[PDB]
Amino acid sequence: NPWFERISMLVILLNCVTLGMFRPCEDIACDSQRCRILQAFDDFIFAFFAVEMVVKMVAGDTWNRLDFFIVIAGMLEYSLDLQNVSFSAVRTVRVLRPLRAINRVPSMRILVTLLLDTLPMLGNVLLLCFFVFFIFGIVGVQLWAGLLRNRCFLPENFSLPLSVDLERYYQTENEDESPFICSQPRENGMRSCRSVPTLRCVNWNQYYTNCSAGEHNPFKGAINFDNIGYAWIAIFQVITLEGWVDIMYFVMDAHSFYNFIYFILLIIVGSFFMINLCLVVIATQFSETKQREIVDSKYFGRGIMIAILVNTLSMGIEYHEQPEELTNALEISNIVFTSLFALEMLLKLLVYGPFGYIKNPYNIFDGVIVVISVWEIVSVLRTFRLMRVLKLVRFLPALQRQLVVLMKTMDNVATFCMLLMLFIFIFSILGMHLFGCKFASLPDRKNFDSLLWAIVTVFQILTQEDWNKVLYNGMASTSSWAALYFIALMTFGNYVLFNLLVAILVEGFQFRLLCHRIITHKMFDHVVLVIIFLNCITIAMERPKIDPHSAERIFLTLSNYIFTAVFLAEMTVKVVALGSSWNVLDGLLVLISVIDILVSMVSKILGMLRVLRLLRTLRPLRVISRAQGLKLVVETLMSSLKPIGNIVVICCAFFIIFGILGVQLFKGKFFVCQGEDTRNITNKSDCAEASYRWVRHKYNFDNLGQALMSLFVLASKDGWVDIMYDGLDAVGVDQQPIMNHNPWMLLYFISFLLIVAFFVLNMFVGVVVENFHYLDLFITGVIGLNVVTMAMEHYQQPQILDEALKICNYIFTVIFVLESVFKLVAFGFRRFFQDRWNQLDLAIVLLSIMGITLEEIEVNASLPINPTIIRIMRVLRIARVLKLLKMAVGMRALLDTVMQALPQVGNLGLLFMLLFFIFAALGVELFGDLECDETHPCEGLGRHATFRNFGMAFLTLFRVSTGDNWNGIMKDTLRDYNTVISPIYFVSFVLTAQFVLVNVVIAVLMKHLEESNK
C-alpha cells in the first residue's frame, strides 16, 4: 500500500519527460524512429494508468474525478486512432496529464485545497470586472468602430499608371505596426491627410487625399473596436499596462485628442483599483482559511572588515578599454590581499587549535576561499573573486539574523515553487501544440518550437513584457479565439497564483510679541498656501518657445519678483517671532531664489546659472509643511522604511554583485554594425570596408556605471527582453553578434529577475506586517437581456439587425416606465422618493425617454438637429446596467471597505501629484528643446509624447509611471550632459512613483485585513 503511492509518481515523471520532447516541427509525421518509440512509451503509460483505475474500482470525491476524466479522454483518442480518420484537436487534451501529480504529492494537495477554498470569495471582484469590461467595452464600440481601418486613399476617378507599384493608399515603412491612420471630415482627430511626406521626378504621395475606411486594422487585425470581442482584447491590454500607449495613439490620430480621458480612467479604475483589489481579497481570505484550520581583540577583527570591503570595491572598476597599466596594478592588488588571508588562516590555525578551527563553521568557508584563490594565483577562477564578498557575514550580526529568516522563507515557499513550475510546464506543452511551427518562420525569437524556447516564452509572458507581440502572432496565425490562451495564462498566473504567494508570506511572518500672534492665527497657514498655488501656475507656464522680448516673458519676469519678496517676508517674520526640519527647507528655497535674482542682474555665467533654474523647480514642495494631511503622511512613509532597512542593504549589495558579474561576462561585447544587408559581416574592420556604422548598444556592461543602469532596466522589467537578447548574442570583443550564440546566459538574466522579485516581495510584506502591529427579480432578467442587445452592435451590421435593436429599445424603455408606475402604486409618492435607488431608477428612465423621442425627430427630419446629441444620448444609454448595483449586495460591501480607507488614499494621491508637478517642471527644463523628426529618429518619443511644454510632460510622466516604454524615452534623451542627468532623472521618478503606489495598496489592505479581525 505505501509503495503504491510512490511508484505512481515515477510514471508521472516518465509522462512529463515524454510530453516534453514532443518536437512540434518534426512530429507532423510519425516516420522518425524517435517519434515511434515515444508513441510506444505513451501507449504503455496509458495502460498503466487505466489499470490503476480498475484497482481503485475495487473500493470518487474530487481528485479521482479529475483522474477519471483523463483516462476517458485517453480512450477517446485510441478509439479514433484505429479507424484512421480523425481531427487533430483531441491530441491537445493530453496536456492535462501532469495534473495527476497534485494528488500524489501530499504538500501540493493541501495547498491547492486552500486555493480552491478562497476562490469562491473572489467572485465579487469578478462581478466588478464585468462592469469595467462592459461599460468601457460598449462605449469603445460606440466611439471607435471602424475608425482604425481608415487610410488616405486616391480619389475614385484617379487612374494610376501601370508601372509605379503604389498600393493606392499610403503605406508606411512598417504598415502593420504603425500604419498612417487619418481622420475623416466627420471627426476631429490629430492626423489629417495634409501631413503625408513627399515621396522620396513625380511623387504620388501628394495625391493621397481621400480619407476612407480600408480593409484591415493595425497589428495584423488584432487591435480594433468593431466588436465587443475585439474591444475586450484591447481593454485587457490596457489592464495589464502593456502597450496601452500604442492603442491610445491610434485613437488620438483618428477620433480626437480628448480620447485620453477614457484611457486615464480605465487605468485608475481597472488597472489599479481592480487588479490590486484582487490581491486584497486573496491575502485576507487565505489568512482566515488557515486560522479556521589576541586574534579576537576586535582590532584584528576590524582589520579584516576593511580588508574585505577594499578588496571588493577594487573589483568594481573593471572598465572596458583600460590602459593595461591599471590591469597590472589590479593583479598586484590580488597578490597583496590573498597573502593576507593566507596569513589570517595561519594565525588562527596556530593560536587556536585546529580541532576548534573546523569546529567554527565560519572558518571552514574562509579556508576554502584561501585554497581556491591561492591555487588560482599560483577564466572561471578569476570570476570566483566575487564570492569573497560573503566574508562580511561574520563581522556583523544584524544581517546574520536577516539572512537566517530570509532562508526560513524558502522553506515555506518550496511547495509553491513546485506548483509554479507545474503551471509553466503545462502551458508550455499547450503552446507547442496550439502554435508550434506557425509563426513568422528567419523565424522570430518568440516561438513555441523547441520546449526551451517555449518555457522562456511562457515565463516572458508572465512578466508582462512584449506579450502583446506574442498575442498578435498567435491571433493572426490560428484564429482570433487564440486570445483565450493568453488570458488564461495571465489571469491564472498573475492574478490568482502570484497573490497566493503574497498570502503565504503574510501568514508566514505572523513688535516681536505681536509678530508671534499672527503665526498662531489659523488663516496665515492658509493664505500662504494660496500664494504657493499662485506660484504653481507660473511654473507650468514656463516653456522653451516664449519670446524673450514679449508680453509673456515680462509677466514671468515681474511675477518672479513679487513671489520672491513675499516668501522672504514670510521667513523674516518667523525668525523675529520664534528665534524644525521644514523651516530649514523653506529657508533654502528662498536662499536659492534671491541669488537667482542677483545673477540675472549681472548679465560661463549661464552654465552656472542653468543649475539655479533646476533648483527653482523644487518650489512646489513648500506646501508639504503647510498642508496638515500631507505632513503626517510623508513622515509616516519615511518612518515605515526603517524595518526593511536591512533587506534593502542585502538588495543593494546584490545589484553590485550581479553588477560586477555582469561586467566581467559582457565587457565590450555589446557592439553592433547597423547597416543595409549586414549578413556577411563578422567583425569590426569588416564594417570599415562596407562603410557601415559600428554602434554601441544603449544599455550595456562596459563599466559598473553602465551596468547598474542595465540591471535597473531589467529589474523594472520594461525592455528586459532586448537586453537578454544582447547577452545571448554576445560573442567577442570586436566581433559581430550572432543570434543565440550562448544560450547558457539565460541563467544570468532569469536568476536576476527571480531574486529581485523575491526581495521586493519581501520588502512588501515587511512593511505590511509592521503596520499591522417577484418584481425586481424580473427587472434583473430584463437588464440581463439589455446587456446582450447592446453588445450585438458592431461595425457594418445589416439593416435587419439594425432595425431589430430599435424595436427592442422600444420595449425596454416602455417596461421601465411601466415598472416605475406600477411600483409607485404600492408606495404612493413618498416611499418612492424616500428610497435612494428609486431616485436612481427614475433618473435612468428619464434619460431613456429623453433620447428616444429625440432620435425620432432626426428620422422625422423636421429639424436637421445636431447628430452629436444623438450619439451622446446613445452612449448615456449604458446607464441602464447600474440598476444591477442594488442586487449586488456582496460587491457593494467590498467597495464600502475601500471608502473607509479612502481618506488615506486621498492623502497619498495628492502626494502623487506633487511628484508629477516637480518632475514635469524638471522635464521641461531638461528635455524640452529636443525634437523627433524625419531627420532624427526616436524610439520612445514622437507626436504624442514630448516634453515640449507642461501639459505634454504631464502625460509623458503618466506613461512613465505605468512603466510602458519608459526606457525608449530614456534612450531618446541620451541620443546626442544627459549621460549623467538622464539616469538620475528616471531612476528617481520610477523608484518614487512605485513607492507611492505601493503605499496605496498597503493602505487598502490594512483597512480590509483589520476589519476581518474585528
Ligand X SMILES: CCCCCCCCCCCCCCCCCC(=O)OC[C@H](COP(=O)(O)OCCN)OC(=O)CCCCCCCCCCCCCCCCC
Ligand Y SMILES: *[C@@H]1O[C@H](CO)[C@@H](O)[C@H](O)[C@H]1NC(C)=O
Ligand Z SMILES: CC(C)(C)NC(=O)CN1CCC(CNC(=O)c2cc(F)cc(Cl)c2)CC1
Q: Using CB under 6 A as the criterion, which residues of the chain lie in contact with ligand X when the complex forms?
A: 95, 227-229, 241, 257, 261, 380, 383, 386-387, 426, 430, 434, 438, 478-479, 481-482, 484-485, 488, 648, 651-652, 661, 715-717, 742, 744-745, 747-748, 751, 760, 763-764, 788, 791-792, 794, 796, 949, 951-952, 954-955, 962-963, 990-992, 994-995, 998
Separation in Å, CA 770 to CA 26, 402, 538, 580: 56, 15, 42, 27
Q: Which is nearer to ligand X, 137 or 564 (CB)?
A: 137
Give the HSE-up count for residue 17: Cα atoms under 13 Å, Cβ half-sphere: 7
Piece of 140-148, 253-261, 494-502, 572-580 that binds ligand Z (CB under 6 A): 494-502
Q: Which is nearer to ligand X, 174 or 796 (CB)?
A: 796
Instruction: Figure out which of the listed residues 387, 882, 987, 1006 binds ligand Y01, where binding follows CB under 6 A.
Output: 987
Q: Which is nearer to Ca ion, 464 or 780 (CB)?
A: 464
Q: Which is nearer to ligand Z, 141 or 502 (CB)?
A: 502
State how beta strands 693-696 and 210-213 pair.
unpaired
Instruction: Figure out which of the listed residues 52, 187, 686, 858 binds ligand Y, where binding follows CB under 6 A.
Output: 686
Separation between Cα atoms, residue 735 and residue 694, nearest integer Å: 10
Q: Which is nearer to ligand Z, 392 or 998 (CB)?
A: 998
Q: Of Ca ion, ligand X, ligand Y, none, which one does residue 268 interact with (CB within 5 to 8 Å by kind)? A: none
| Contact flag: residue 641 with ligand Y01 (CB under 6 A) | no
| Contact flag: residue 979 with ligand Y01 (CB under 6 A) | yes
Separation between Cα atoms, residue 452 and residue 879, nearest integer Å: 49
Q: Of ligand Y, ligand Y01, ligand Z, none, which one does residue 497 interact with (CB within 5 to 8 Å by kind)? A: ligand Z
Piece of 151-159, 258-266, 555-563, 917-925 that binds ligand Y01 (CB under 6 A): 258-266
| Contact flag: residue 415 with ligand Z (CB under 6 A) | no
For residue 86 the three cell numbers come to 480523425
Instruction: Figure out which of the listed residues 17, 26, 116, 155 binds ligand Y, where binding follows CB under 6 A.
Output: 155
Instruction: Figure out which of the listed residues 586, 718, 855, 925 binds Ca ion, where binding follows CB under 5 A.
Output: 718
Q: How far is the CB of 731 from ligand X (least distance, A)?
A: 8
Instruction: Using DSSP, state whether 700 is helix, strand or coil.
Output: coil
Contact 227, 144 (CB under 8 A): no
* Long-range residue pairs from 164-173, CB within 8 A, at least 24 positions apart, any chain: 164/204, 166/204, 169/208, 169/214, 170/196, 170/205, 170/208
Separation between Cα atoms, residue 755 and residue 676, nearest integer Å: 40
Q: Of ligand Y01, ligand Z, ligand Y, none, which one does residue 156 interact with (CB within 5 to 8 Å by kind)? A: ligand Y
* Long-range residue pairs from 585-592, CB within 8 A, at least 24 positions apart, any chain: 585/621, 585/622, 585/625, 586/622, 586/625, 589/618, 589/619, 589/622, 590/564, 592/616, 592/618
Q: Which residues pair with 213 in a beta bridge?
A: 150
Q: How far is the CB of 960 from ligand Y01 (least distance, A)?
A: 15
x-or-dash string of contact with ligand Y01, 260-299, rule CB under 6 A: -xx--x---x------------------------------
Instruction: Using DSSP, state whether 223 is helix, strand or coil.
Output: coil
Q: Which is nearer to ligand X, 434 or 804 (CB)?
A: 434
| Contact flag: residue 586 with Ca ion (CB under 5 A) | no
- The residue count for the chain: 1014
Q: Of ligand Y01, Ca ion, ligand Z, none, which one does residue 1001 interact with (CB within 5 to 8 Å by kind)? A: ligand Z
Q: Is the dihedral angle over the CA atoms 119, 124, 129, 130 positive or is it negative?
A: positive
Number of residues that bind Ca ion (CB under 5 A): 2
Torsion, Cα of 635, 640, 642, 648 (10° steps): -120
User: What's 367-414 look like in SS3?
Assistant: HHHHHHHHHHHCCCCCHHHHHHHHHHCCCCCHHHHHHHHHHHHHHHCH
Piece of 102-110, 249-257, 525-533, 679-687 that binds ligand Y (CB under 6 A): 679-687
Separation between Cα atoms, residue 486 and residue 427, nearest integer Å: 10
| Contact flag: residue 178 with ligand Y (CB under 6 A) | no
Instruction: Figure out which of the listed residues 497, 650, 653, 898 binds ligand Z, where binding follows CB under 6 A.
Output: 497
| Contact flag: residue 210 with ligand Y (CB under 6 A) | yes
Contact 653, 386 (CB under 8 A): no
* Count of other CB atoms within 10 angstroms of residue 326: 11
| Contact flag: residue 718 with ligand Y01 (CB under 6 A) | no
Q: Which residues pair with 735 in a beta bridge?
A: 683
Piece of 134-142, 200-208, 489-497, 684-692 that binds ligand Z (CB under 6 A): 489-497
For ligand Y01, the nearest residue by Cβ is 705
Separation between Cα atoms, residue 261 and residue 241, nearest integer Å: 16
Piece of 94-102, 230-238, 325-333, 979-987 that binds ligand Y01 (CB under 6 A): 979-987
| Contact flag: residue 246 with Ca ion (CB under 5 A) | no
State how beta strands 693-696 and 150-153 pair.
unpaired
Q: Of ligand Z, Ca ion, ligand X, none, which one does residue 459 interact with (CB within 5 to 8 Å by kind)? A: ligand Z
Instruction: Figure out which of the listed residues 409, 682, 820, 992 binds ligand Y, where binding follows CB under 6 A.
Output: 682
Q: How far is the CB of 914 from ligand X (least distance, A)?
A: 12
Q: Which is nearer to ligand Y01, 586 or 702 (CB)?
A: 702
| Contact flag: residue 259 with ligand Y01 (CB under 6 A) | yes
Site for ligand Z in 431-460 (CB under 6 A): 459
| Residue of 506, 446, 559, 589 whose CA lies nearest to 282 | 506
The H or E element containing residue 150 is strand 150-153
Contact 459, 489 (CB under 8 A): no
Q: Of Ca ion, ligand Y, ligand X, none, which one does residue 751 interact with (CB within 5 to 8 Å by kind)? A: ligand X
Q: Of Ca ion, ligand Y01, ligand Y, none, which one does residue 677 interact with (CB within 5 to 8 Å by kind)? A: ligand Y
Residue 798 DSSP one-character state: -
Contact 945, 969 (CB under 8 A): yes
Q: Is the dihedral angle over the CA atoms 937, 943, 949, 952 positive or is it negative?
A: negative
Q: Which is nearer to ligand X, 1 or 799 (CB)?
A: 799
Instruction: Figure out which of the listed residues 17, 28, 75, 313 binds ligand Y01, where binding follows CB under 6 A.
Output: 313
Q: How far is the CB of 366 from ligand X (least distance, A)?
A: 15
Instruction: Using DSSP, state whether 455 is helix, strand or coil.
Output: helix
* Count of other CB atoms within 10 angstroms of residue 695: 13
| Contact flag: residue 716 with ligand Y01 (CB under 6 A) | no
Q: Which is nearer to ligand Z, 272 or 832 (CB)?
A: 272
User: What's 98-109 look like in SS3?
Assistant: HHHHHHHCHHHH
Q: Of Ca ion, ligand Y01, ligand Z, none, which one does residue 718 interact with (CB within 5 to 8 Å by kind)? A: Ca ion
| Contact flag: residue 215 with ligand Y (CB under 6 A) | no
| Contact flag: residue 680 with ligand Y (CB under 6 A) | yes
Q: Which residues pair with 695 in a beta bridge?
A: 672
Q: Of ligand X, ligand Y01, ligand Y, none, which one does residue 153 interact with (CB within 5 to 8 Å by kind)? A: ligand Y
Q: Burial code of 475-486, b = ≥16 C-beta within 10 A, e = fewer?
A: bbbeeeebbebb
For residue 1004 the three cell numbers come to 487598502
**CB under 8 Å to 812, separation ≥6 — which residues?**
782, 786, 789, 848, 880
Contact 112, 102 (CB under 8 A): yes
For binding to Ca ion (CB under 5 A), which residues are involved? 465, 718
For binding to ligand Y (CB under 6 A), which residues are involved? 153, 155-157, 210, 212, 677, 680, 682-683, 685-686
For binding to ligand Z (CB under 6 A), which residues are involved? 459, 462-464, 493-494, 497-498, 502, 757, 764, 998, 1001
For binding to ligand Y01 (CB under 6 A), which residues are involved? 135, 139, 143, 187-188, 255-256, 258-259, 261-262, 265, 269, 313, 316-317, 319, 321, 652, 655-656, 702-706, 708-709, 712, 979-980, 983, 987
